[PDB]
Each structure stands twice: as structure tokens, then as C-alpha cells.
A paper describes a structure:
Two sexual-stage surface proteins essential for Plasmodium transmission, Pfs230 (5) and Pfs48/45 (6), are expressed in both gametocytes and gametes. Pfs230 contains fourteen 6-Cys domains, whereas Pfs48/45 contains three. Here, we report the molecular structure of the endogenous Pfs230:Pfs48/45 heterodimer in complex with six antibodies with potent TRA as determined by cryogenic electron microscopy (cryo-EM).
Pfs48/45 adopts a disc-like conformation in our structure with Pfs230, with Pfs48/45D1 (1057 Å2) and Pfs48/45D3 (478 Å2) accounting for the majority of contacts with Pfs230, while Pfs48/45D2 (112 Å2) contributes more modestly. Pfs230 binds to Pfs48/45 on the opposite face of the disc conformation compared to the C-terminus of Pfs48/45, where the GPI linker is located for attachment to the PPM. While the N-terminal region of Pfs48/45 remained largely unresolved in previous structural studies of Pfs48/45 without Pfs230 implying flexibility, this region is well-resolved in the Pfs230-bound structure and reveals that unlike other A-type domains, Pfs48/45D1 features a different β1 orientation and connectivity, localizing to the interface. An analysis of single nucleotide polymorphisms (SNP) across P. falciparum revealed that the interface between Pfs48/45 and Pfs230 is highly conserved. Given that Pfs48/45D1–2 contributes 1169 Å2 of a total 1647 Å2 buried surface area within the Pfs48/45-Pfs230 interface, it is conceivable that Pfs48/45D1–2 is sufficient for Pfs230 binding, allowing for Pfs48/45D3 to retain a range of motion in the complex. Together, our structural and in vivo experiments demonstrate that the C-terminal region of Pfs230 is essential for the formation of the Pfs230:Pfs48/45 complex.
Author numbering:
A (entry chain D): 30 to 430
B (entry chain A): 2044 to 3118
Write the structure that this text describes.
Amino acid sequence: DFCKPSSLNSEISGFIGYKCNFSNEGVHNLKPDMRERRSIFCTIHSYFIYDKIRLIIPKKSSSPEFKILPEKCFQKVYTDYENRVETDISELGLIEYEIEENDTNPNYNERTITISPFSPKDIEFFCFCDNTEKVISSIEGRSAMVHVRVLKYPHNILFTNLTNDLFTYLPKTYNESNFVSNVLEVELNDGELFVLACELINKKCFQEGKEKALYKSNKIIYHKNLTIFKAPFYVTSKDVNTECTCKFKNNNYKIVLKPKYEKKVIHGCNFSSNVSSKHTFTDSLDISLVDDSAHISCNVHLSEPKYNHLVGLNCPGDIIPDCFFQVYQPESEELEPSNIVYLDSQINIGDIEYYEDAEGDDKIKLFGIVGSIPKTTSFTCICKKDKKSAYMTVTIDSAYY
Amino acid sequence: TAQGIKHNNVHLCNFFDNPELTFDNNKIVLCKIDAELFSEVIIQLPIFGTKNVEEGVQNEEYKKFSLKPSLVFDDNNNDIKVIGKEKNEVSISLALKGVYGNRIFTFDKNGKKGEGISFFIPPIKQDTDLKFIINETIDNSNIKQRGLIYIFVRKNVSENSFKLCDFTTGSTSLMELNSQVKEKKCTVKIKKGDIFGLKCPKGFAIFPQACFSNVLLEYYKSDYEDSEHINYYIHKDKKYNLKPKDVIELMDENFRELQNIQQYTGISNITDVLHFKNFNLGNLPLNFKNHYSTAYAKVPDTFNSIINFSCNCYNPEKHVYGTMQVESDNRNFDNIKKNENVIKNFLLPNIEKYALLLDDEERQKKIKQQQEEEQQEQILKDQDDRLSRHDDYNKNHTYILYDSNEHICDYEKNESLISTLPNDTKKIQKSICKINAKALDVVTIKCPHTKNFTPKDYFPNSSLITNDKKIVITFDKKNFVTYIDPTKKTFSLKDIYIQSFYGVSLDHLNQIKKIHEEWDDVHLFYPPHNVLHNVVLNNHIVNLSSALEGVLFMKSKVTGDETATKKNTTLPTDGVSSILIPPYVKEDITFHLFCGKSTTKKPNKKNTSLALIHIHISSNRNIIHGCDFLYLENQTNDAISNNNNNSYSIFTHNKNTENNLICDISLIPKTVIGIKCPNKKLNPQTCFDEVYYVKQEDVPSKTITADKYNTFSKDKIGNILKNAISINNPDEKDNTYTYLILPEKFEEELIDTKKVLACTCDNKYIIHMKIEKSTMDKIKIDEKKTIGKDICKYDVTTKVATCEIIDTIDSSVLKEHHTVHYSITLSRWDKLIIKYPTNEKTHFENFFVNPFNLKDKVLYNYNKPINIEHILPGAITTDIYDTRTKIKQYILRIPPYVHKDIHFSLEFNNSLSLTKQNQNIIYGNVAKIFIHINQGYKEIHGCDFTGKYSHLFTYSKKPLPNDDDICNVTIGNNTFSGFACLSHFELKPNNCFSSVYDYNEANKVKKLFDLSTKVELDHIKQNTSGYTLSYIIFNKESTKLKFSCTCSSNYSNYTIRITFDPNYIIPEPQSRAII
């Protein structure tokens, strides 16, 4: 029932995955091959909560020409991609991070780095794997690079301390003295990251609750006696009770997390006649009360430097493709399956705060946008029912590109 | 009470024409054989009962002989029979411990046919008693005996020292092999003075032929324990390393057998060089359709070094073969320069384009234009393509004839891959060059230099003559020129079996036992000469002349220097040579060739390096056109012989109504002809430069003569107006016939309708090149091509996606969309289905598929096929045939996970089909298909047990000897899971996940549907690469139960523990590969 926080991430056999593999047998080897010529970026542009990014490289005894730049990556990393300026990773200001160098395999060498979300500022570091020096019949090798832009979490950190250890770089907003009757209740704004320190926690710490149905997008991870709780972008009710239990000092401390309730007007479209549902949409165009199979459309547009908006679609019937994990590519006269593309790639954000709900036959797909998109992007979700179809379009013209 | 005619390495007892053992003697007449040591045992008995052999030697006075049993003695032959106590017989193959070579033979000169009985001794550890009788049968009360026989084979081996691979039965038995399982393993371990044997099951034949007399050059390391050194020549205790004269080098006009025996030869002499007691069945093993292809050999006593090699069984009926590994157990190299120190490397080729219509200086001045255009479309697909690359090219272009290319694997350029390290001499190197060549592509390989043999002959020819060398021996549909002892009749089919490597002419046979023949060069190579002819097959040698029908050996060119002349293809004399890949190939089997280097004239693994080269050749499915004159000879053979049921040829062989000498061939575009005439026997040799014109006088043309084609007049077009490149070089006496082809478009201006040009071959058959108005009508109706870019259908509630194909290219419908291109973009787990006809359905009687299979020959590069599993692993295949409508369907469900943008094309074609409506002709059409997938999502939450699938499953369990695993998986709804196990393994319980154990219910077997009715399933029992996979997806199941499976095998087991539980432990990173 109760175990140390770090033990919850070890409950898996084999390997956890999430590896940037550039070995000869890896995902994209650098060996001279006629089958590919494009550059390789295993970029993961996103916040990191003790997340594991692993680099797999061939053994030097097998591929001496294979270079590792910096040679002790991730212990040493590059901060200038174009110029490859080497700096010690510790000098980047990374907070409570760790790196590993595993070589328990004759075929390859493994490098693993874990990054906490506690960096006071955005940190970007790069590691280069160069095999272009392999001159085989004048056929140069390919170059691989691991991009890890550790963005400072774009929300306040509500840290609670219930341990015998001191966290130098944490806000330490709450501690044991704030637990009334061994119970602490705090309010988190949309997307706020909550962190709890405790040596012995329940295996379901912030995983179960009474009214936490709206709190499930959390990627709850545990490390360094710390439990990290990433609040979802959007909620529909204030009373979202997420509970955790801490056994600090043999006392049953209780931690309750609830949103700072402020419903976000959805900068999307509502094709359902139920315009009084739990959600609110900027644009509404009822599919019903439409005869002769007349098509309807709604061009949603967004443009701001930073994005704290909620974009989604509400419509009866089925969505083709099933948004938002796959969405149409806007570049076509008719938005047919030939335009199917992943939304994570369409808007260049992999940190999309997906939120899906349904009311009867009405499919509701919503997702939160935090930060900014490096390029202007747009996507379209088509909703079809019987003989009539509704076209949903979002144009996110962020101040970039 | 005495012995017989035992002849040490040979054993014989002739009672037919032997004065010692014939009825002429009125005293004791009997023979005894103490056979041993894998040597033949010949019994040449008189005729027992009137047999259809000859007359005169079997006159009435010599016809009153008979003794049981008088069985079949014609070309059809059963196992030799040996009489026993009951006066009846038992099969010799079981009377002695596995006899081989049980064949009957007869003498030909003056028709002295006799029931010769030859058989080769197998390993035997005891003295076996076989007894016969010889009886005279005049009539009842006149039956008198005159002799008997007694075979007394002796002990020559021991059970411990004898290793055998009885491929008939066992887990490695080759009988169970089918289209899905092609090969099984076996080995024989032989230490000092051991015995090894091979026995293919009935229906297989041993290859390479002459094994084990000549075997693979794989490993050669010396041992200190050896008592006798090696010489590499006919001297010392070995009797090989010489080449033939009077079989292949001395030929005459009457010799018509030159191109009919170029099947298998060219292997190295190491085993002979190593004094191995090699015994073989030559190039003609037993009648394996009802017999076992068997051979035996023994380790030499005075030799104890290291050698590695292998030989194989084979059968093309089901594409099944078995490898036989042979090695010396005395591996006295377990610590120095062994496999661990053998560095493995790879090489890539240099690519050019063949001079299809160009010359030497054009190689530098013009072929650049050809080379710089083809790859533009591939570049367009790589970069320009964003949605789908349809065939939008419909004007001012041609594809079929422009795809020719050239590939070169030069090792003299990459000396590091074959030469020893300059300073790090503590290791040896191995290299492998890969060429993925296709049809119409010239493959030229470069390697170090090594030259051929040089026999010699000497004799004082004066006041002497040798006129006792005029005799032949006939058996198994063949007649052989061999030699016989005048009195003792001591010879051997072993001599006949090796006669392919030797011959005797004139009077020069002085002191052959002492020969030190050497090459003109020092470097080691395998095969010694003409590597591109005797192409290697990984661990097997075969002749390319017959193995690859239609192959052309292309001249070598080290340099086009000022002294250049008409060079030849001989390798490795100059280290350069070239061949042509025919458009039609019998099978997709790949071929190889070995290259090596050394420092001195007597080197070995201690001072040598090994290199390998790989060239891939595409197969074909559509029969060629033209006449195979050797097939007409095969028809005359069918008249000669009755057991030629396997009358299969790769040519349609269009037949005239009544005449056989005539070959009425129609020059049709988009077709390939295969007129097969040996070397340049085609007459005139300048044909078609010089031809003979006959006119449409007799429709059947039954009354025609070949000699008539000598007097005709020609004044049309001209004689020298169109010239082509050389495509037949008779320097190599084993070259194929010329090839004639046409482009995608044809012209009607220069045709002559009522007249036909002709050429002759074999002095009997006549070639006729005609053209019909039907072809002109077909082209005039098909030139107007219309192309339509359509889209397919799909459903989301079922996640189905399929296109319409068959209703498009019907040849009985008026066409406004003569061509249609279908591109359909799919995603994970999408079940694609392809419906296509065959060449039997109504209005589709000539339909053909390009590529040649939707399941294993899809296209990855422009007009370059490859298997689906080589680039798209974990794909399910299911090819089926409809019961009535003659419809062929395929299932192409996409793998759940994909790591890179993927788009492959596979086409169809029905242009060869047509039908008649209202006395008018309606022709066929063409179609194409394109698919797009892109990356997947939610990579499989399971475990892999093959290694190569490491990028598809979370866990990659690389198998190890006697391995065990506990693959615990916890998945939720909409979560993909599965496992991959080797095809050779067995799934226990069977058909997982369809029926699986229960984790909590005492591992009870429960049906997948019973466990959860919402569980979709898909299974891969076996695939081309040799792996077994199972797929499972849970969709909105309102329960959390558990189950388990287990992959099991003799030396490997894997356990899968499965529990179903909704969960989410992914932050959606989805590692982003830019590719």
C-alpha cells in the first residue's frame, strides 16, 4: 500500500524505453547507406518531470570512427547547436538532475539522463553523434543529434515539504506546519505543477480520489522523495478532489489538490444543439435544423504571443479522422483522408493537454495550449453524421515563424 | 573354396564375359567378394530369361538361362536384390548397412549387353554373408547348376566413428518441408579417422556434384599432430589436381552433348589436397524419385589438420533443400585465428549503366546522360512526393528498356577488406559485398588475380599404336565412352562418375601418378576458374550456364589501353569479368562468389584472408516465347523413353498445325522470345544480318525443307542499315542464345505482311518471324490511353479501408478510363485487402501481376522490388482463391507500429487480355495501387524473441542457448500488445492468443472470444523471415482478468504473463525521427 516514491517508477520489466537510438542497428544508424540522406533530429521539445531521455551509441571497439560529441554526454553537453559550444551540464543550472552511463551490453553503450522540472529558467542542451568521417568509397556518413529543450514549467510550483531533507531550490510554499489535523488543502491554477516531498507515500498518491475524474491527464512521477502532480489544463468543476497520503513522522498526513476554478471559453466550435452543456465554445453552428444535406463550416482563428487557450470541437456523430490524435492536413481543396496527419506534428507541439468527453451521442474533443507554437499552423476536423457533414477549422497564428 | 576378383579399391565378379567365371569352364565356377571401404562391388551376371537387351550374344544357345528373380532391368531400376537362404532375395540396401549406387549397366560394343550389377559399399562393422546361385534352365529335369556367388563384405568402421544425417526422419527431416519451410539443419562430427555419410530422402538429389571429392574452401588451418605434410598436387598419397582433355577440350562436329552437361562443376581440390578418402556418385546419382541420394567418405589416417566444407540436397518441386555441414573435430585452432578473430566486414558496389547502344569511348562520353536521368524520379519521390506518386507520365517517355544498370564490387580498390592488416597482423578479415541487382542489369565483379590449370602429355609415338579404345557403355538413358580390362573386366562407374573431369586421346598416358600441375598465378581463389560461371551459393557451387538459363557471360576489361583486344570472361586470371541478368529467371535464389589473397604459393588460414560477394537476381513467373530446339530433342526422347513425365520448359514453344521443323513466331511488342540454339549453331551465323525469305504459299506449310533456305533475293530495307551491340561472344563455348526485344511503342511502316524471314539451327528446325494484322489492330485500338486518378472507400465504425480493382480493367467493356491509379492512405492496424484476377478468369485469361507477388515482392525503390518484411516488419499475409469466380484476394493489414514515413507501390496489368463482341475485339487494360502509412502510435506493449524486431516491441529478448524468460505485461483498453517467436518454435498452447491459459484459473485453456467478446485478434503463424507473431487489441472491455501464453522449444522456452488493467504511464513523448 505504502512505498517510497522512487520505487513506483521501477515497476516494469525489461526497459522503460524512450531512447534516442543511433547505433548501427538502432532506429536510424549513421552508417553510409543509399537508403536515406536526410538529417536526424530526435528532438523532444517539452517540459520534463524526472523524464528519461536515453542515447544509444555503438561500442567504440566495434565502430571507432563513431564520434560522441561531447564524449561524456550527457555529463557534458552543447548549448549552441550551430557552433557546438561545450559546457558542463551542471553549469546549465539544471536542478536535482542525474545522469547514467550503462555499458552492460557487448553490442552498444547506453547513456541515460533524467531531468527535473525545477530548472529556474529554460535550458536547452544538445548532444551530437557524428559518423560523417566514415569515408567508404567517398560515401560520407550521416549525423545525428539529440535535442532536449528543458523548458521551465510555465506555471507556479506549489511545493509541500514533509521530509527530513532540505530542497534548496524549491519555493517551499507549504510544509508540515501548514497541515491542520494532518490535512493540507491547496488550490492549483490551470496547469499548475504541484510537488509533494515525502519519504513514504501510498502507491496511489494523487492517482485516486473522490472527485478527481477531471484530474487524470497528470503524468504523476516520483523521484528524490518528491511526488510531482501536473495539473490538467482544463476542468469543468471546482470540486476536483485528488487525495494522497504521506506517512511522515508516523502521521497520516493528507494532501488535497483542487483547481483554481476558472472555466476557459473554448476557442473552438460547437456543432451540437446543446449549447448549454458543461463546456463553452466561442463559435457555435448547430448541425440540426439543416435540410437538403447542406454543409456547414466554422473558421476558428487564434493569434497571440503566448497561448493559454482551450481549443476543441463538440459535435454529434463520429469524427473522421478520430480527433485529436489524428487530424486532416489543411492543404487540400477537399479535406479527405489523403490529408490525415497527427496533430502533435501539425501544430509542432507534443505537450498538447488532451481532454476528451462525451454527452450522449455528442463527441467532445478538447485540448489545451500552453506556451507558443514555433510556426503558424492550422488543422481541420470533419464531423459527419448520416448525410450531412460539419467542417471544423482552427488557425493558430502564433507570433512566430 | 577360394577368393574372387577382389581388386583392393575396386571389387568385381564378372560371370558374363569373364573366361574365369563363364560357362566355358567345365569345372568349379564361382566368385567371392570381400568388399570394403566405400568401394564399388560389380557383379556382371549372364542373362536370366529372355530379356530385351540384344541378340547374337543372347542367341538361342545362350538364351536357356534363368534364375529368380527376373525383375525390371531397363532405365527404371529398383534397389539391387541379393539372394538368401530361402532362394529368394532381399534389398541390398538393407542386407548391407545402407548401400548406395545400386544401378544396372550394359556393354555396347558388338551388342554385348549384360546385366551388370554395381553398388558402392556403405559403412559396415561386421562380416555380412550374402550368397547367390547360378543355374542353367534348359527345361524341367534339365535344370543344372554351374556356379554361385558369395559376397563377404568386411568390417571397416565403428559405431562411434560413424556419423550420419538420416534426413528421411527426425525433427530436421526434410520431408515436412513445404512452401513455408524450406530448409533444416544437420551436421556430422568427425575426429581422427572418423566416418561421415549423407542420405537425402527420396525425391532429392545431392549437390554440388562430385562431392565430397571437391568441396567448399571455407577454412584451412594446419595442426602440429599431423604426421605427413601436404603437397597440393597429384604426388604424395593424393591423385587429383588435373584437368580433362578428351571430354571437353577435343570436340568434333558429331558431338552434340556440349551444352547438355554444363550443370555442376568447378569446385576446389582441397579435400583431394588433404588426402580425404572421398567417394561420390558423380553427376548421375541413383533414381532418387524412388531411392536415396547417398554418399560416404572417411577421414584420412595420416592427416589431422582442420578443414570446413558442406554439401546440400535439393528439389525444385517445393523449393526445399538441406545443408550438410562437415568439419574436422580435431579443431586445433580454438585460441588463435579462429572465428572469433575473423573480422566481418561489408562492402558496397560502384554503379554505372550498361552500353545497350554505345561503345568504349561512349562509356565516358555518353553513358553519363543515361546515368543522370533515371534517378530523378527516385529523387522526386524522396523529396517532391507529399501525398502519393501516381504514374502521371503519359507522353514522351519510356521505362522498360531504360532501367538497365551496371554494378561493380571491386576489392582491389578496397584492399583493406581482403588484405591482412598492415601492422595488426594478429587478426584475419572476412568481407561481404552486397549487390541488389535487377533485370537487364550487367553485374561485373573485380577481385585479385589467379590463373587456371595447364595439363601436359608425353609419349614416344613410334612403331606402336593404341587402337583398343573404341567402346561405349549404356545405362540410364545415356551412353558413355569408357575403358575395360581385356580379360578381368575390371573398371568402375566411379571412373565414369569422374570422367567429367578427365579423358584420354591418342597415345599419351605416361606417368600420370606423378604430376605437379600448378596455376600460372599464386593467389588462392574459390572456384579456381570462371567464378562467374561456377557461381558460389554461400556454401554451394553451381554452374551459371544451366542454373541461370539465358545468362550471357560478358567480356572482362581491366583497361581499354592501346594494346586492348577482344578479351574474355575468364576469372580470376585478370581479376575482372561480367555477366548479364536475364529478364526471366526460374527462381529468386541468390548467388555468390568467393575471393581471397595470400602471400606465398603454399599458404593457409594462418597466412590468408577470405572475402565474399553477393549479387541478387529477380525471379519471373511468365513463360518466354520462342522455340527450344533442345525441347524438340526432349520430345524425341519422350518417344525414346516413357518416364519423362516432367516435361517442363520455360518457353511457350508455339507449334505449327502440322509441321514441326517450322517455328511460326509472331513478333509482338511487350514480349520476350527465347529461341534456344547452342552457342552459334544458328545458321547463318550472321543471322539475322543474313536471312532467307519464304512467302505465304501453304497455310500449314507441312511440305517444307530446311536446306531450301539457300536461294532467295532481298532488296528491301537493305543489308547493313541498322547495327546493334555484341550480345554473343562464342569465345566461351558455354554461351547462350541471342536475345530480341522491342520498346513500349511499335511502328507499322516497315512491316512485310505476306512474307517471312527465316534462319536455321540444328540442320532440322526453321525459324519464322511473322507479323499479323491482329497486332496492328490491337495497337491501333490501344494507343488512345485514358488515365483516371480515383480514390477508395473506408469506414470509421469498423476501421476498414479497401479499394475497388477488378471492376476497372475488364476487357469486355468499352473503355474511357483505360488506366486507373489507386492511392489509399492508411494508419496502424488498418486491414487492407487487394482483389485481383488471374490468367484464367473470363476476360482476364492473360492477366499478369507486376510486381510478381503482392505479399513478398512489393516495390520500395522505383521499379525495384523487395520483400515486405525486409522494410515493413510484422505484416500479415493471406493469399486466397475464390471457389467459382476465379478471384484472387490478398490481406495486407498494416503493422500496429511504424517508425518512419512509408509509401510503397505495387501494380497490375491486363493489357494481354481481349475478347470478341459482335465480331469486334475489345482488349484489356492496366491498373496500379499505392499505399501510405507513416508512423504509428502506442508502440506494442509486449516482448520480442527475435532481436531484429527490437524497434517494434518494448522488450527485445535476444535468444541464447537454453534460455528462459518471464514476460510480464500489464495493458489497458486501446493498448496494443503482442509477441514474436521464431517460426521453428512451437506455440504451447497452440494458436495463442486465440486460446490461452488462465493466470488465476490453474492455467486453464480458455478461448479468446470467451475471455472477452470485444477482443480483436490477428495471428502470423509464419513469415518469410522465419518468425511467428501474435497480435491482440482490447477495445472498451468492462472487466480486468488475466491470462498467459508460452513459446516452447527443445532448447528455448519463453513464458508470457498477461493481465488486463486500464492504465496510463506515458507522457506522450513519441520520439520524433525527422525521417
